[PDB]
Short mmCIF file of C-alpha atoms in Angstrom, two decimals:
data_model
loop_
_atom_site.label_atom_id
_atom_site.label_comp_id
_atom_site.label_asym_id
_atom_site.label_seq_id
_atom_site.Cartn_x
_atom_site.Cartn_y
_atom_site.Cartn_z
CA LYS A 3 -2.56 -30.01 3.89
CA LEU A 4 -2.68 -32.08 0.45
CA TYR A 5 -5.42 -30.86 -1.57
CA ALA A 6 -6.49 -33.11 -4.79
CA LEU A 7 -6.80 -32.14 -8.73
CA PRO A 8 -9.82 -33.23 -10.84
CA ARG A 9 -8.99 -35.19 -14.00
CA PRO A 10 -9.60 -33.00 -17.22
CA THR A 11 -13.46 -32.58 -18.92
CA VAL B 1 4.49 3.93 2.44
CA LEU B 2 0.48 5.11 1.31
CA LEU B 3 0.94 3.44 -1.67
CA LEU B 4 1.28 -0.61 -2.24
CA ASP B 5 1.16 -2.51 -5.74
CA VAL B 6 -0.91 -5.78 -4.58
CA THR B 7 -2.98 -8.53 -6.12
CA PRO B 8 -6.22 -7.13 -5.21
CA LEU B 9 -8.25 -10.76 -4.78
CA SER B 10 -6.72 -13.82 -3.84
CA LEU B 11 -4.99 -16.46 -6.23
CA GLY B 12 -5.42 -19.94 -6.57
CA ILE B 13 -6.59 -22.83 -8.49
CA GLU B 14 -9.94 -25.52 -8.02
CA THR B 15 -9.26 -28.51 -5.82
CA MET B 16 -11.27 -31.81 -5.50
CA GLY B 17 -14.83 -31.03 -4.84
CA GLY B 18 -15.88 -27.45 -6.22
CA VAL B 19 -13.48 -25.77 -3.94
CA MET B 20 -10.88 -23.48 -3.96
CA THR B 21 -7.52 -23.29 -2.86
CA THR B 22 -5.42 -20.03 -2.60
CA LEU B 23 -1.67 -20.39 -3.97
CA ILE B 24 -1.23 -15.99 -3.14
CA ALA B 25 -3.29 -14.48 -0.57
CA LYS B 26 -5.63 -11.49 -1.42
CA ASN B 27 -3.71 -7.57 -1.09
CA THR B 28 -0.41 -9.63 -0.94
CA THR B 29 2.95 -7.19 -2.80
CA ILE B 30 3.90 -7.56 -5.82
CA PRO B 31 5.97 -9.00 -7.06
CA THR B 32 5.80 -12.81 -5.73
CA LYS B 33 5.86 -16.60 -6.04
CA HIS B 34 4.39 -19.11 -4.44
CA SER B 35 4.33 -23.20 -4.92
CA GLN B 36 2.48 -25.86 -3.58
CA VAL B 37 1.90 -29.45 -3.95
CA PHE B 38 -1.15 -31.25 -4.75
CA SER B 39 -2.57 -34.73 -6.06
CA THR B 40 -4.28 -36.71 -7.44
CA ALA B 41 -8.32 -37.23 -6.80
CA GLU B 42 -8.53 -40.74 -8.29
CA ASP B 43 -6.27 -43.72 -8.26
CA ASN B 44 -4.69 -44.31 -11.39
CA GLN B 45 -5.52 -40.75 -12.76
CA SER B 46 -3.63 -40.40 -15.35
CA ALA B 47 -3.89 -35.95 -15.99
CA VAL B 48 -4.94 -33.63 -13.98
CA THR B 49 -6.46 -30.58 -14.63
CA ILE B 50 -5.60 -26.78 -13.31
CA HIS B 51 -8.23 -24.07 -13.14
CA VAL B 52 -7.03 -21.00 -12.57
CA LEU B 53 -9.02 -18.86 -10.42
CA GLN B 54 -9.10 -15.00 -8.76
CA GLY B 55 -11.27 -14.37 -5.64
CA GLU B 56 -12.12 -15.15 -2.21
CA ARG B 57 -15.46 -17.64 -2.18
CA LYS B 58 -14.38 -21.24 -0.72
CA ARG B 59 -16.71 -22.05 -4.02
CA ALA B 60 -14.49 -22.46 -6.66
CA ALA B 61 -17.66 -21.38 -9.19
CA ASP B 62 -17.82 -18.26 -7.56
CA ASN B 63 -15.09 -17.04 -8.30
CA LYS B 64 -13.39 -15.82 -11.52
CA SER B 65 -11.91 -18.07 -13.88
CA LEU B 66 -8.45 -16.68 -15.45
CA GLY B 67 -7.61 -19.91 -17.36
CA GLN B 68 -7.40 -23.75 -17.57
CA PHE B 69 -4.54 -26.32 -18.78
CA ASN B 70 -4.01 -29.63 -18.54
CA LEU B 71 -0.97 -31.74 -17.02
CA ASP B 72 -1.18 -35.46 -18.36
CA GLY B 73 0.78 -38.60 -18.39
CA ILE B 74 0.94 -38.84 -14.28
CA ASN B 75 2.06 -42.53 -14.22
CA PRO B 76 -0.33 -45.05 -12.49
CA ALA B 77 -0.59 -44.66 -8.46
CA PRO B 78 -3.48 -44.15 -5.98
CA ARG B 79 -5.01 -41.10 -5.41
CA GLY B 80 -3.19 -38.56 -3.27
CA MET B 81 0.44 -40.27 -3.93
CA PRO B 82 1.28 -38.29 -7.26
CA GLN B 83 3.44 -35.46 -6.57
CA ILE B 84 2.30 -31.83 -8.63
CA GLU B 85 4.02 -29.25 -8.40
CA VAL B 86 2.41 -26.12 -8.39
CA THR B 87 3.47 -22.64 -8.95
CA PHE B 88 2.29 -18.99 -9.16
CA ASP B 89 4.70 -16.38 -9.69
CA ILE B 90 3.50 -12.58 -10.14
CA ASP B 91 6.30 -9.99 -11.67
CA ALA B 92 6.75 -6.40 -11.66
CA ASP B 93 4.15 -5.61 -14.37
CA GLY B 94 1.54 -8.00 -13.13
CA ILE B 95 1.64 -11.04 -15.50
CA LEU B 96 0.65 -14.37 -13.37
CA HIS B 97 2.68 -17.22 -14.95
CA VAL B 98 1.38 -20.49 -13.65
CA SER B 99 3.37 -23.69 -14.10
CA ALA B 100 2.29 -27.23 -12.99
CA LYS B 101 5.72 -30.14 -12.49
CA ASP B 102 4.88 -34.05 -12.18
CA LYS B 103 7.74 -35.01 -9.69
CA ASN B 104 7.77 -38.61 -10.77
CA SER B 105 7.18 -37.45 -14.86
CA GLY B 106 9.36 -34.60 -14.88
CA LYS B 107 6.57 -33.72 -17.51
CA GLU B 108 5.28 -30.19 -16.90
CA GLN B 109 2.73 -27.86 -18.60
CA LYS B 110 2.93 -23.52 -18.11
CA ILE B 111 0.41 -20.35 -19.05
CA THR B 112 1.05 -17.44 -18.49
CA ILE B 113 -1.87 -14.57 -17.66
CA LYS B 114 -1.99 -11.22 -18.61
CA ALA B 115 -2.08 -8.01 -16.31
CA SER B 116 -5.69 -7.41 -17.46
CA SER B 117 -7.41 -9.96 -16.63
CA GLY B 118 -9.56 -10.68 -14.05
CA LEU B 119 -11.82 -8.61 -11.84
CA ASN B 120 -11.97 -4.78 -12.62
CA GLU B 121 -12.13 -2.47 -9.42
CA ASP B 122 -15.87 -2.90 -9.30
CA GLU B 123 -16.12 -6.79 -9.27
CA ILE B 124 -13.31 -6.50 -6.96
CA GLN B 125 -15.31 -4.74 -3.97
CA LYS B 126 -18.41 -7.31 -4.99
CA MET B 127 -16.34 -10.24 -4.14
CA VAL B 128 -14.48 -9.07 -1.22
CA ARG B 129 -18.55 -7.85 0.29
CA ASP B 130 -19.94 -11.34 -1.48
CA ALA B 131 -17.37 -13.44 0.25
CA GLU B 132 -17.84 -11.80 3.75
CA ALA B 133 -22.12 -12.33 3.30
CA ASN B 134 -21.39 -16.11 2.64
CA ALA B 135 -18.52 -16.44 5.62
CA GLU B 136 -20.48 -18.69 7.04
CA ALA B 137 -22.14 -20.66 4.29
CA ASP B 138 -18.90 -21.26 2.62
CA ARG B 139 -17.32 -23.15 5.96
CA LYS B 140 -20.18 -25.46 5.61
CA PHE B 141 -19.84 -26.33 2.07
CA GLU B 142 -16.22 -26.83 3.12
CA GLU B 143 -17.70 -29.33 5.51
CA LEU B 144 -20.25 -30.53 2.60
CA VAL B 145 -16.91 -31.03 0.64
CA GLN B 146 -15.52 -33.34 2.89
CA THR B 147 -17.84 -35.66 2.52
CA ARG B 148 -19.29 -35.68 -0.58
CA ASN B 149 -15.57 -36.13 -1.12
CA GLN B 150 -15.27 -39.37 0.77
CA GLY B 151 -17.98 -40.75 -1.02
CA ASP B 152 -16.68 -40.25 -4.60
CA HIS B 153 -14.28 -42.19 -3.17
CA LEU B 154 -16.52 -44.87 -1.97
CA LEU B 155 -18.19 -44.88 -5.51
CA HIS B 156 -15.01 -45.03 -7.50
CA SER B 157 -12.64 -48.10 -5.43
CA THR B 158 -16.06 -49.98 -4.40
CA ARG B 159 -17.06 -49.97 -9.06
CA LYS B 160 -12.96 -50.55 -9.06
CA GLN B 161 -13.42 -53.97 -6.71
CA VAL B 162 -16.89 -54.81 -8.83
CA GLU B 163 -15.04 -54.90 -11.20
CA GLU B 164 -11.92 -56.64 -10.87
CA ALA B 165 -13.87 -59.25 -9.08
CA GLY B 166 -16.78 -60.16 -11.60
CA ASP B 167 -17.64 -63.21 -11.94
CA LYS B 168 -17.33 -64.28 -8.56
CA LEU B 169 -19.49 -62.10 -7.62
CA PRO B 170 -22.51 -63.38 -6.67
CA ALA B 171 -25.21 -61.93 -8.78
CA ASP B 172 -27.37 -60.97 -5.50
CA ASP B 173 -24.83 -58.88 -4.39
CA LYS B 174 -23.75 -56.72 -7.98
CA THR B 175 -27.54 -55.72 -8.27
CA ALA B 176 -27.75 -54.38 -4.60
CA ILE B 177 -24.26 -52.92 -5.37
CA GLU B 178 -25.90 -51.51 -8.49
CA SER B 179 -28.40 -49.55 -6.56
CA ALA B 180 -26.29 -48.80 -3.44
CA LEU B 181 -24.45 -46.72 -5.91
CA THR B 182 -26.80 -45.26 -7.78
CA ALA B 183 -28.57 -43.97 -4.28
CA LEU B 184 -24.95 -42.56 -3.12
CA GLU B 185 -24.41 -40.66 -6.37
CA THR B 186 -27.51 -39.34 -6.21
CA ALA B 187 -26.80 -38.02 -2.81
CA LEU B 188 -23.65 -36.37 -3.94
CA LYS B 189 -25.70 -34.04 -5.55
CA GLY B 190 -27.58 -32.51 -2.38
CA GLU B 191 -25.89 -30.76 0.43
CA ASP B 192 -26.66 -33.09 2.82
CA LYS B 193 -23.65 -34.27 4.61
CA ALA B 194 -25.80 -36.94 6.91
CA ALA B 195 -27.67 -38.36 3.62
CA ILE B 196 -24.05 -38.71 2.35
CA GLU B 197 -22.99 -40.68 4.75
CA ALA B 198 -26.01 -42.79 5.10
CA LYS B 199 -26.21 -43.78 1.65
CA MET B 200 -22.43 -44.74 1.74
CA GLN B 201 -23.52 -46.83 4.61
CA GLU B 202 -25.71 -48.45 2.64
CA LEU B 203 -24.00 -49.29 0.30
CA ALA B 204 -20.77 -50.75 3.09
CA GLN B 205 -23.91 -53.26 3.79
CA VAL B 206 -24.29 -54.45 0.86
CA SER B 207 -20.39 -55.01 -0.12
CA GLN B 208 -19.26 -57.55 2.15
CA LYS B 209 -18.90 -60.15 -0.22
CA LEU B 210 -17.17 -57.97 -2.47
CA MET B 211 -14.93 -56.69 0.27
CA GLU B 212 -14.21 -60.83 1.01
CA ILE B 213 -13.12 -61.08 -2.60
CA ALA B 214 -11.40 -58.21 -3.64
CA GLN B 215 -9.57 -58.73 -0.42
CA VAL C 1 -6.92 -6.95 -13.45
CA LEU C 2 -4.43 -8.97 -11.03
CA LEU C 3 -3.10 -6.13 -9.90
CA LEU C 4 -4.04 -2.74 -8.46
CA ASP C 5 -2.19 -0.02 -6.08
CA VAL C 6 -4.43 0.21 -2.54
CA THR C 7 -3.40 2.37 0.40
CA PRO C 8 -2.36 -0.76 2.68
CA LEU C 9 -3.46 0.46 5.88
CA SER C 10 -6.38 2.34 7.19
CA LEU C 11 -6.07 6.02 7.70
CA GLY C 12 -8.13 8.41 9.67
CA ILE C 13 -8.16 11.04 12.57
CA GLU C 14 -7.68 11.54 16.51
CA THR C 15 -11.40 11.58 18.04
CA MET C 16 -12.01 12.44 21.56
CA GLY C 17 -11.01 11.11 23.98
CA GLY C 18 -7.91 9.67 21.67
CA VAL C 19 -9.30 7.20 19.66
CA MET C 20 -9.01 6.29 15.78
CA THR C 21 -12.07 7.23 13.37
CA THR C 22 -10.70 5.99 10.23
CA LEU C 23 -11.61 8.15 6.87
CA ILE C 24 -10.16 5.37 4.54
CA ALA C 25 -9.98 1.78 5.35
CA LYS C 26 -6.54 -0.30 4.78
CA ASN C 27 -6.63 -1.76 1.12
CA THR C 28 -8.90 0.38 -0.67
CA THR C 29 -7.81 1.16 -4.40
CA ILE C 30 -6.27 4.23 -5.09
CA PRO C 31 -6.81 7.20 -5.96
CA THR C 32 -9.33 7.00 -3.53
CA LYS C 33 -11.54 9.97 -1.85
CA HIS C 34 -13.59 10.03 1.57
CA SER C 35 -15.01 12.82 3.46
CA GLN C 36 -16.71 13.26 6.79
CA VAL C 37 -18.25 15.50 9.28
CA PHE C 38 -17.04 15.95 12.27
CA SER C 39 -17.91 18.65 15.63
CA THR C 40 -16.67 19.83 18.93
CA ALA C 41 -15.84 18.38 22.04
CA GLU C 42 -17.02 20.70 24.21
CA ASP C 43 -19.13 24.24 24.15
CA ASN C 44 -17.55 27.12 23.03
CA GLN C 45 -14.57 25.51 21.06
CA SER C 46 -13.12 27.59 18.57
CA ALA C 47 -10.50 25.73 17.52
CA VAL C 48 -10.05 21.76 16.61
CA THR C 49 -7.17 20.11 15.54
CA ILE C 50 -6.79 17.05 12.70
CA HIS C 51 -4.28 14.50 13.82
CA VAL C 52 -3.56 12.31 10.99
CA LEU C 53 -3.23 9.08 11.51
CA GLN C 54 -2.17 5.31 9.74
CA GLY C 55 -3.59 1.91 11.13
CA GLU C 56 -4.85 -0.32 12.62
CA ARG C 57 -5.66 0.11 16.69
CA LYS C 58 -8.27 2.07 18.04
CA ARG C 59 -5.49 3.51 20.52
CA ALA C 60 -4.46 6.99 17.73
CA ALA C 61 -1.12 6.90 20.17
CA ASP C 62 -0.66 3.17 18.64
CA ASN C 63 -1.31 4.39 14.94
CA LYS C 64 1.63 6.29 12.80
CA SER C 65 1.33 9.44 13.17
CA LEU C 66 1.35 11.67 9.15
CA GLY C 67 1.26 14.81 10.16
CA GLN C 68 -1.56 17.45 11.76
CA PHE C 69 -2.84 21.24 11.63
CA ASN C 70 -5.26 23.29 13.22
CA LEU C 71 -8.46 24.78 12.15
CA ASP C 72 -9.54 27.98 13.90
CA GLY C 73 -11.61 30.81 13.77
CA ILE C 74 -14.71 28.55 14.41
CA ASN C 75 -17.63 30.64 15.83
CA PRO C 76 -17.55 29.43 19.58
CA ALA C 77 -20.74 27.73 19.81
CA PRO C 78 -22.55 23.95 22.04
CA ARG C 79 -21.18 21.27 21.57
CA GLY C 80 -21.95 19.49 18.42
CA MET C 81 -22.86 22.12 16.23
CA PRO C 82 -20.14 22.98 14.25
CA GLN C 83 -19.84 20.84 11.14
CA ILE C 84 -16.17 19.92 10.32
CA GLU C 85 -15.93 18.53 7.43
CA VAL C 86 -12.79 16.27 7.05
CA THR C 87 -11.77 15.25 3.59
CA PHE C 88 -8.81 12.75 2.72
CA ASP C 89 -8.04 12.25 -1.03
CA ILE C 90 -5.62 10.23 -2.22
CA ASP C 91 -4.09 11.05 -5.71
CA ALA C 92 -2.73 8.32 -8.41
CA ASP C 93 0.44 8.61 -6.95
CA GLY C 94 -0.48 8.24 -3.41
CA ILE C 95 -0.11 12.02 -2.40
CA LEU C 96 -2.68 12.25 0.77
CA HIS C 97 -4.14 15.20 0.93
CA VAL C 98 -6.11 16.13 3.75
CA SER C 99 -8.60 19.25 4.51
CA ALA C 100 -10.64 20.50 6.92
CA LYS C 101 -13.26 22.90 6.37
CA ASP C 102 -16.00 24.41 9.09
CA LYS C 103 -18.94 24.68 6.89
CA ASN C 104 -19.98 27.70 9.13
CA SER C 105 -17.61 30.14 8.73
CA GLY C 106 -16.02 28.10 5.41
CA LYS C 107 -12.78 28.26 7.22
CA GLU C 108 -10.46 25.71 5.80
CA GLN C 109 -7.40 24.43 5.94
CA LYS C 110 -5.12 21.57 4.79
CA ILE C 111 -2.30 19.49 3.99
CA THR C 112 -0.02 17.81 1.17
CA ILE C 113 1.78 14.07 3.24
CA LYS C 114 4.04 12.28 0.49
CA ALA C 115 3.60 8.64 -0.64
CA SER C 116 6.46 7.56 1.09
CA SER C 117 5.51 8.65 4.40
CA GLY C 118 4.40 6.57 7.02
CA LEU C 119 5.11 2.45 7.54
CA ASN C 120 7.17 0.00 5.35
CA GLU C 121 6.44 -3.60 4.57
CA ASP C 122 7.19 -5.24 8.10
CA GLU C 123 6.34 -2.35 9.52
CA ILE C 124 2.41 -3.08 7.94
CA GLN C 125 2.30 -6.93 8.61
CA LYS C 126 3.56 -5.88 12.54
CA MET C 127 0.54 -3.19 12.28
CA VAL C 128 -1.79 -5.29 11.05
CA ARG C 129 -0.45 -8.90 13.30
CA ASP C 130 -0.71 -6.48 16.40
CA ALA C 131 -4.10 -5.30 15.60
CA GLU C 132 -5.36 -8.58 15.91
CA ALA C 133 -3.58 -9.84 18.76
CA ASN C 134 -5.01 -6.94 20.47
CA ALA C 135 -8.49 -7.25 19.10
CA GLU C 136 -10.53 -7.57 22.07
CA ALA C 137 -8.44 -5.18 24.13
CA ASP C 138 -8.94 -2.48 21.45
CA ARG C 139 -12.35 -3.06 21.19
CA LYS C 140 -12.64 -2.29 25.70
CA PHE C 141 -10.30 0.49 24.93
CA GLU C 142 -13.00 1.76 22.23
CA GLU C 143 -15.77 0.91 24.49
CA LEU C 144 -13.98 2.70 27.09
CA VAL C 145 -13.63 6.20 25.15
CA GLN C 146 -17.51 6.39 24.57
CA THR C 147 -18.48 5.95 28.11
CA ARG C 148 -15.90 8.38 29.00
CA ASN C 149 -17.14 10.78 26.31
CA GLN C 150 -20.79 10.43 27.54
CA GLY C 151 -19.18 10.73 31.35
CA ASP C 152 -17.19 13.73 30.27
CA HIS C 153 -20.68 15.14 28.60
CA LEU C 154 -22.91 14.25 31.79
CA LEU C 155 -20.84 16.35 33.90
CA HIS C 156 -20.91 19.29 31.73
CA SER C 157 -24.52 19.24 31.20
CA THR C 158 -25.18 18.68 34.22
CA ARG C 159 -22.80 21.83 35.53
CA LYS C 160 -24.46 24.02 32.95
CA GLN C 161 -28.11 23.02 34.79
CA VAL C 162 -27.39 23.26 38.50
CA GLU C 163 -25.52 26.98 38.10
CA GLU C 164 -28.77 27.44 35.49
CA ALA C 165 -31.46 26.90 38.03
CA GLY C 166 -29.39 28.49 40.65
CA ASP C 167 -31.91 29.00 43.16
CA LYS C 168 -34.98 26.98 42.32
CA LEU C 169 -32.65 23.31 43.48
CA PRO C 170 -32.90 22.45 47.01
CA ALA C 171 -29.14 22.84 48.77
CA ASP C 172 -29.97 19.00 49.88
CA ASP C 173 -30.23 18.50 45.85
CA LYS C 174 -27.33 20.42 45.00
CA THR C 175 -25.16 18.46 47.66
CA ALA C 176 -25.38 15.59 47.00
CA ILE C 177 -25.07 16.30 43.05
CA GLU C 178 -22.08 17.66 44.08
CA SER C 179 -20.53 14.58 45.22
CA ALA C 180 -21.79 12.64 42.71
CA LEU C 181 -20.16 14.84 39.84
CA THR C 182 -16.96 14.29 42.27
CA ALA C 183 -17.11 10.69 42.13
CA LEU C 184 -17.86 10.49 38.48
CA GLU C 185 -15.13 12.66 37.44
CA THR C 186 -12.80 10.02 39.53
CA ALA C 187 -14.35 6.99 38.11
CA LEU C 188 -13.80 8.85 34.57
CA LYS C 189 -9.80 9.15 34.67
CA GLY C 190 -10.12 5.43 35.77
CA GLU C 191 -10.40 2.53 32.53
CA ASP C 192 -13.22 0.92 34.37
CA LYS C 193 -16.34 1.39 32.00
CA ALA C 194 -18.85 -0.12 34.40
CA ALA C 195 -17.60 2.37 37.14
CA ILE C 196 -18.20 4.77 35.04
CA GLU C 197 -21.23 4.13 33.76
CA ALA C 198 -22.44 3.30 37.90
CA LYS C 199 -21.62 6.70 38.86
CA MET C 200 -22.95 8.01 36.20
CA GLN C 201 -26.31 5.94 37.04
CA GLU C 202 -25.88 7.75 40.76
CA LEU C 203 -25.54 10.97 39.49
CA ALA C 204 -28.58 11.05 37.97
CA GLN C 205 -30.58 8.98 40.58
CA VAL C 206 -30.13 12.18 42.33
CA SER C 207 -30.38 14.64 39.70
CA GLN C 208 -33.67 14.22 39.34
CA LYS C 209 -35.34 17.78 41.00
CA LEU C 210 -32.97 19.35 39.01
CA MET C 211 -34.09 17.68 35.53
CA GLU C 212 -37.68 18.89 37.23
CA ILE C 213 -35.69 22.18 37.22
CA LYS D 3 -22.05 8.45 13.54
CA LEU D 4 -21.21 12.25 14.34
CA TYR D 5 -17.16 12.27 15.96
CA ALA D 6 -16.18 14.67 17.79
CA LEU D 7 -12.92 17.03 17.49
CA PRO D 8 -10.28 18.10 20.42
CA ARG D 9 -9.43 21.46 20.79
CA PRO D 10 -5.90 22.32 20.47
CA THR D 11 -2.80 21.90 22.55
#
């Protein structure tokens, strides 16, 4: 449903 | 019709754990546009990377990278609470426009990806076959990633709590915890689900005082 | 490339027993060309019909007809002998060219089908849905037809062998066989695969001598 | 593998 995004780098 | 102008492969972004999440399905007629809300992987994360991918594999690393951008200035919040709306718009010229907007901060960032980007015809055919051959391994990878992500989350929240608690945490405990954390960290690098959950258990067993303190 | 022209549905022809046989898979990039050899359903067949279809259904009748044409002047021969080469070619403008050529006689026929032909976007998506929702039944039909075709061919064969042995076949043998033929002919009209096979087996059972002969 | 074709009509 709700997927999560990584922080940069 | 005998002829349709379509996106030959699925288009999406990378999500937590190295997973491909699709925004536009393969063989969708152009022009087209789709939006989906995402959030942050960790508590108080201030920025996200939007890694635009083309392909059919559940493993992000096995798909074709079309581009990337960051969206920063995300206000402090528990993980999963910010609302990052990602929009993919493919126009009649085949140019892909990708934007992300933080509904709270109102900040937005965009890129434009030219029509000639990604995989060529031969590669497209290979990709479809590849995905078909790996359908079961990819289902297993998805399961793995669920556990991995739970594990990462426990790792992160434990670390935070230790710090928050600093001095009030008996040295006995903080030694056992640092060891368990490390063990868990290692486990995460594997594709054994049980081993991950087991390392999480071992960390939990040495965290009771931390939990009391933190709470 | 982020985009491409594809043919949006499978394209093929009707083969023996009313089944669709695909030459170009759905979502194949165009232009494209695909050729495949077919033969004749029964002995001494001097013509075939090429019925051009678009869709994902196993029953030819369930797919969209794009056209047809006959190929005549084939030398009458045993079923399976003629080598009829069927070529589907879609050019860059989405125009479909279908030809059939009999390799022996060199006789050929062809048709041109305009790019705007066949199913529209909403019809395409319904087709895909209907195919998915009916996947099990379409598979059963396919299997049914394979069995009917086998049983059909067993009739003809058996019949040709009974005539071919004439005298050398005991009357009681011939009788058992004539009766088994009838039962099989009857079963073939049905939609029960096991029933047809069972009649094939009963027929095999009483054909042993004829088989020696 | 080798598919067969009906006669016309």
